[PDB]
């Protein structure tokens, strides 16, 4: 525990509330909602870190704040994962939360419940099983295809894709990638928007170990929204040399998005921040320079960083990823550890 902003007795839910409010401030009762949402661990004091770091945040907190720009608008999102242990109890906490979201105003958890058995187990492996996010409310769930080892990740992902009706765009991706999944494009996570109908989306996050910016770009050429070279230019550009130990320890990620009635996936690039960059200030300078050269809003990005961060940025290590899509309908997001641990 290491905070100038929070006392050790502040609760997880109170930190969550504070971060969400400050993110809105940077963009220019909630507490009640979040206590309920994080029931019952949301009441735990933040001063006592979990036994096992949460996957959801690079500082191991059970909370991660996100701000997303798209279609000339910005929105705040919050990711959550139980800090409880051991892994099986953490998993069951998440299962419980999914079921508590069912029947919330616009929610559909049916697609999640039809593949849930694939990403849960009585003896789970890997650094997580279940996590969620809320956006302002729509919800999503994150699942670990490596719950029973990495070697089964592609198979488990594929079977879920099939159950969900998305075999065709999943086939398109799989063939584009050469027909097999390896460390070059490894299924590291799945997400689902818990909504019914055409707006339903599943994202498959592929990690890219030991490949160049150009090769990563080319893996996206099957995407509905592929802008040739744009991923290569973001990666080379923001993150420079691909041979640093820090690059190799946290490789880039592409989120492929799948929707009903869509023959091919969309693609969004996830650019690792800390620890590829030495601090949030260094990462900020380079991300801002890239945003400007793309004509995107670097001021709003920096305003959010400033509003939400608890330490001066050269001493702050809270940016996990930024995400980026170029072209006519550009997207940018930043994902932030609370920076409490």
PDB file of C-alpha atoms in Angstrom, residues 57-207:
ATOM      1  CA  UNK A  57      -4.971  -4.142 -12.903  1.00  0.00           C
ATOM      2  CA  UNK A  58      -1.210  -3.950 -13.369  1.00  0.00           C
ATOM      3  CA  UNK A  59      -0.842  -2.890  -9.708  1.00  0.00           C
ATOM      4  CA  UNK A  60      -2.822  -5.959  -8.628  1.00  0.00           C
ATOM      5  CA  UNK A  61      -5.847  -3.962  -7.400  1.00  0.00           C
ATOM      6  CA  UNK A  62      -9.312  -5.503  -8.048  1.00  0.00           C
ATOM      7  CA  UNK A  63     -10.221  -2.319 -10.024  1.00  0.00           C
ATOM      8  CA  UNK A  64      -9.108  -0.774 -13.335  1.00  0.00           C
ATOM      9  CA  UNK A  65     -10.419   2.511 -14.778  1.00  0.00           C
ATOM     10  CA  UNK A  66     -10.744   3.070 -18.494  1.00  0.00           C
ATOM     11  CA  UNK A  67     -11.635   6.038 -20.693  1.00  0.00           C
ATOM     12  CA  UNK A  68     -12.679   5.394 -24.275  1.00  0.00           C
ATOM     13  CA  UNK A  69     -12.971   7.883 -27.158  1.00  0.00           C
ATOM     14  CA  UNK A  70     -15.042   6.885 -30.169  1.00  0.00           C
ATOM     15  CA  UNK A  71     -17.460   8.579 -32.566  1.00  0.00           C
ATOM     16  CA  UNK A  72     -16.702  12.068 -31.230  1.00  0.00           C
ATOM     17  CA  UNK A  73     -17.692  10.986 -27.727  1.00  0.00           C
ATOM     18  CA  UNK A  74     -15.909   9.804 -24.616  1.00  0.00           C
ATOM     19  CA  UNK A  75     -17.048   7.413 -21.929  1.00  0.00           C
ATOM     20  CA  UNK A  76     -15.766   6.030 -18.667  1.00  0.00           C
ATOM     21  CA  UNK A  77     -15.573   2.321 -17.900  1.00  0.00           C
ATOM     22  CA  UNK A  78     -14.537   0.351 -14.856  1.00  0.00           C
ATOM     23  CA  UNK A  79     -13.187  -3.184 -14.760  1.00  0.00           C
ATOM     24  CA  UNK A  80     -13.620  -5.334 -11.636  1.00  0.00           C
ATOM     25  CA  UNK A  81     -12.300  -8.645 -10.363  1.00  0.00           C
ATOM     26  CA  UNK A  82     -12.743 -10.118  -6.870  1.00  0.00           C
ATOM     27  CA  UNK A  83      -9.561  -9.720  -4.761  1.00  0.00           C
ATOM     28  CA  UNK A  84     -10.552 -12.784  -2.708  1.00  0.00           C
ATOM     29  CA  UNK A  85      -8.674 -16.065  -2.745  1.00  0.00           C
ATOM     30  CA  UNK A  86      -7.893 -18.722  -3.587  1.00  0.00           C
ATOM     31  CA  UNK A  87      -8.455 -18.815  -7.372  1.00  0.00           C
ATOM     32  CA  UNK A  88     -11.553 -21.003  -7.061  1.00  0.00           C
ATOM     33  CA  UNK A  89     -13.247 -18.582  -4.680  1.00  0.00           C
ATOM     34  CA  UNK A  90     -12.222 -15.641  -6.924  1.00  0.00           C
ATOM     35  CA  UNK A  91     -13.842 -17.498  -9.834  1.00  0.00           C
ATOM     36  CA  UNK A  92     -17.032 -18.253  -7.942  1.00  0.00           C
ATOM     37  CA  UNK A  93     -17.284 -14.595  -6.907  1.00  0.00           C
ATOM     38  CA  UNK A  94     -17.270 -13.721 -10.622  1.00  0.00           C
ATOM     39  CA  UNK A  95     -19.834 -16.368 -11.465  1.00  0.00           C
ATOM     40  CA  UNK A  96     -22.034 -14.898  -8.755  1.00  0.00           C
ATOM     41  CA  UNK A  97     -21.652 -11.397 -10.172  1.00  0.00           C
ATOM     42  CA  UNK A  98     -22.643 -12.545 -13.689  1.00  0.00           C
ATOM     43  CA  UNK A  99     -25.856 -13.980 -12.238  1.00  0.00           C
ATOM     44  CA  UNK A 100     -26.553 -10.771 -10.304  1.00  0.00           C
ATOM     45  CA  UNK A 101     -26.260  -8.820 -13.585  1.00  0.00           C
ATOM     46  CA  UNK A 102     -28.903 -11.000 -15.234  1.00  0.00           C
ATOM     47  CA  UNK A 103     -32.144  -9.118 -15.340  1.00  0.00           C
ATOM     48  CA  UNK A 104     -30.524  -5.710 -14.903  1.00  0.00           C
ATOM     49  CA  UNK A 105     -32.343  -3.343 -17.337  1.00  0.00           C
ATOM     50  CA  UNK A 106     -30.655  -4.024 -20.697  1.00  0.00           C
ATOM     51  CA  UNK A 107     -28.654  -7.107 -19.817  1.00  0.00           C
ATOM     52  CA  UNK A 108     -28.477 -10.485 -21.468  1.00  0.00           C
ATOM     53  CA  UNK A 109     -26.213 -13.088 -19.859  1.00  0.00           C
ATOM     54  CA  UNK A 110     -27.513 -16.034 -21.918  1.00  0.00           C
ATOM     55  CA  UNK A 111     -24.554 -16.054 -24.358  1.00  0.00           C
ATOM     56  CA  UNK A 112     -22.127 -15.985 -21.439  1.00  0.00           C
ATOM     57  CA  UNK A 113     -23.969 -18.825 -19.673  1.00  0.00           C
ATOM     58  CA  UNK A 114     -23.850 -20.966 -22.809  1.00  0.00           C
ATOM     59  CA  UNK A 115     -20.038 -20.937 -22.905  1.00  0.00           C
ATOM     60  CA  UNK A 116     -19.232 -20.382 -19.199  1.00  0.00           C
ATOM     61  CA  UNK A 117     -18.394 -24.056 -18.519  1.00  0.00           C
ATOM     62  CA  UNK A 118     -15.545 -23.677 -21.023  1.00  0.00           C
ATOM     63  CA  UNK A 119     -13.732 -21.001 -19.041  1.00  0.00           C
ATOM     64  CA  UNK A 120     -14.472 -22.272 -15.548  1.00  0.00           C
ATOM     65  CA  UNK A 121     -13.164 -25.318 -13.750  1.00  0.00           C
ATOM     66  CA  UNK A 122     -12.951 -26.693 -10.212  1.00  0.00           C
ATOM     67  CA  UNK A 123      -9.160 -26.460 -10.529  1.00  0.00           C
ATOM     68  CA  UNK A 124      -8.445 -23.299 -12.585  1.00  0.00           C
ATOM     69  CA  UNK A 125      -5.002 -22.395 -13.918  1.00  0.00           C
ATOM     70  CA  UNK A 126      -3.662 -19.069 -15.211  1.00  0.00           C
ATOM     71  CA  UNK A 127      -3.753 -15.616 -13.703  1.00  0.00           C
ATOM     72  CA  UNK A 128      -7.530 -15.146 -13.823  1.00  0.00           C
ATOM     73  CA  UNK A 129     -10.841 -16.787 -14.612  1.00  0.00           C
ATOM     74  CA  UNK A 130     -13.583 -14.164 -14.546  1.00  0.00           C
ATOM     75  CA  UNK A 131     -13.668 -10.396 -14.559  1.00  0.00           C
ATOM     76  CA  UNK A 132     -16.225  -7.775 -15.613  1.00  0.00           C
ATOM     77  CA  UNK A 133     -16.500  -4.155 -16.704  1.00  0.00           C
ATOM     78  CA  UNK A 134     -19.281  -1.614 -16.511  1.00  0.00           C
ATOM     79  CA  UNK A 135     -19.650   1.296 -18.936  1.00  0.00           C
ATOM     80  CA  UNK A 136     -22.021   4.257 -18.689  1.00  0.00           C
ATOM     81  CA  UNK A 137     -25.069   0.925 -17.789  1.00  0.00           C
ATOM     82  CA  UNK A 138     -23.780  -1.835 -19.989  1.00  0.00           C
ATOM     83  CA  UNK A 139     -21.702  -4.715 -18.757  1.00  0.00           C
ATOM     84  CA  UNK A 140     -19.184  -7.093 -20.123  1.00  0.00           C
ATOM     85  CA  UNK A 141     -17.409 -10.174 -18.917  1.00  0.00           C
ATOM     86  CA  UNK A 142     -13.807 -11.251 -19.370  1.00  0.00           C
ATOM     87  CA  UNK A 143     -12.925 -14.964 -19.573  1.00  0.00           C
ATOM     88  CA  UNK A 144      -9.605 -16.849 -19.635  1.00  0.00           C
ATOM     89  CA  UNK A 145      -9.214 -19.372 -22.453  1.00  0.00           C
ATOM     90  CA  UNK A 146      -6.073 -20.585 -20.665  1.00  0.00           C
ATOM     91  CA  UNK A 147      -8.021 -21.673 -17.545  1.00  0.00           C
ATOM     92  CA  UNK A 148      -6.781 -25.251 -18.042  1.00  0.00           C
ATOM     93  CA  UNK A 149      -3.462 -24.366 -19.683  1.00  0.00           C
ATOM     94  CA  UNK A 150      -2.387 -22.352 -22.740  1.00  0.00           C
ATOM     95  CA  UNK A 151      -2.243 -25.456 -24.908  1.00  0.00           C
ATOM     96  CA  UNK A 152      -6.041 -25.693 -24.783  1.00  0.00           C
ATOM     97  CA  UNK A 153      -6.670 -21.964 -25.301  1.00  0.00           C
ATOM     98  CA  UNK A 154      -7.409 -22.026 -29.054  1.00  0.00           C
ATOM     99  CA  UNK A 155      -9.644 -25.110 -28.758  1.00  0.00           C
ATOM    100  CA  UNK A 156     -11.705 -23.645 -25.924  1.00  0.00           C
ATOM    101  CA  UNK A 157     -12.038 -20.297 -27.731  1.00  0.00           C
ATOM    102  CA  UNK A 158     -13.066 -22.007 -30.960  1.00  0.00           C
ATOM    103  CA  UNK A 159     -15.740 -24.098 -29.266  1.00  0.00           C
ATOM    104  CA  UNK A 160     -17.243 -20.965 -27.651  1.00  0.00           C
ATOM    105  CA  UNK A 161     -17.212 -19.178 -31.012  1.00  0.00           C
ATOM    106  CA  UNK A 162     -19.104 -22.138 -32.458  1.00  0.00           C
ATOM    107  CA  UNK A 163     -21.701 -22.276 -29.658  1.00  0.00           C
ATOM    108  CA  UNK A 164     -22.285 -18.557 -30.077  1.00  0.00           C
ATOM    109  CA  UNK A 165     -23.022 -18.718 -33.818  1.00  0.00           C
ATOM    110  CA  UNK A 166     -19.771 -17.097 -34.927  1.00  0.00           C
ATOM    111  CA  UNK A 167     -17.923 -19.940 -36.615  1.00  0.00           C
ATOM    112  CA  UNK A 168     -17.763 -18.108 -39.941  1.00  0.00           C
ATOM    113  CA  UNK A 169     -15.836 -15.020 -38.920  1.00  0.00           C
ATOM    114  CA  UNK A 170     -13.789 -17.184 -36.509  1.00  0.00           C
ATOM    115  CA  UNK A 171     -12.892 -19.401 -39.498  1.00  0.00           C
ATOM    116  CA  UNK A 172     -11.894 -16.328 -41.514  1.00  0.00           C
ATOM    117  CA  UNK A 173      -9.524 -15.189 -38.773  1.00  0.00           C
ATOM    118  CA  UNK A 174      -8.144 -18.664 -38.167  1.00  0.00           C
ATOM    119  CA  UNK A 175      -7.342 -19.200 -41.854  1.00  0.00           C
ATOM    120  CA  UNK A 176      -5.875 -15.703 -42.194  1.00  0.00           C
ATOM    121  CA  UNK A 177      -3.508 -16.492 -39.315  1.00  0.00           C
ATOM    122  CA  UNK A 178      -2.379 -19.648 -41.115  1.00  0.00           C
ATOM    123  CA  UNK A 179      -4.809 -22.073 -39.548  1.00  0.00           C
ATOM    124  CA  UNK A 180      -3.186 -22.424 -36.135  1.00  0.00           C
ATOM    125  CA  UNK A 181      -2.658 -20.384 -32.979  1.00  0.00           C
ATOM    126  CA  UNK A 182       0.766 -20.019 -31.396  1.00  0.00           C
ATOM    127  CA  UNK A 183       2.739 -17.522 -29.273  1.00  0.00           C
ATOM    128  CA  UNK A 184       2.618 -15.207 -32.339  1.00  0.00           C
ATOM    129  CA  UNK A 185      -1.117 -14.693 -31.904  1.00  0.00           C
ATOM    130  CA  UNK A 186      -2.059 -16.390 -28.707  1.00  0.00           C
ATOM    131  CA  UNK A 187      -5.555 -16.307 -27.260  1.00  0.00           C
ATOM    132  CA  UNK A 188      -4.987 -14.525 -23.949  1.00  0.00           C
ATOM    133  CA  UNK A 189      -8.538 -13.442 -23.143  1.00  0.00           C
ATOM    134  CA  UNK A 190     -12.116 -13.333 -24.289  1.00  0.00           C
ATOM    135  CA  UNK A 191     -14.659 -10.650 -23.610  1.00  0.00           C
ATOM    136  CA  UNK A 192     -18.429 -10.486 -24.226  1.00  0.00           C
ATOM    137  CA  UNK A 193     -20.770  -7.565 -24.130  1.00  0.00           C
ATOM    138  CA  UNK A 194     -23.720  -8.850 -22.071  1.00  0.00           C
ATOM    139  CA  UNK A 195     -26.429  -7.483 -24.346  1.00  0.00           C
ATOM    140  CA  UNK A 196     -28.998  -9.165 -26.578  1.00  0.00           C
ATOM    141  CA  UNK A 197     -29.461  -8.918 -30.319  1.00  0.00           C
ATOM    142  CA  UNK A 198     -27.319  -7.444 -33.072  1.00  0.00           C
ATOM    143  CA  UNK A 199     -25.337  -5.324 -30.629  1.00  0.00           C
ATOM    144  CA  UNK A 200     -23.865  -8.467 -29.046  1.00  0.00           C
ATOM    145  CA  UNK A 201     -20.071  -8.579 -29.362  1.00  0.00           C
ATOM    146  CA  UNK A 202     -17.354 -10.991 -28.411  1.00  0.00           C
ATOM    147  CA  UNK A 203     -13.700  -9.977 -28.420  1.00  0.00           C
ATOM    148  CA  UNK A 204     -10.803 -12.384 -28.685  1.00  0.00           C
ATOM    149  CA  UNK A 205      -7.526 -10.861 -27.481  1.00  0.00           C
ATOM    150  CA  UNK A 206      -4.461 -12.319 -29.230  1.00  0.00           C
ATOM    151  CA  UNK A 207      -1.034 -11.675 -27.764  1.00  0.00           C
TER     152      UNK A 207
END
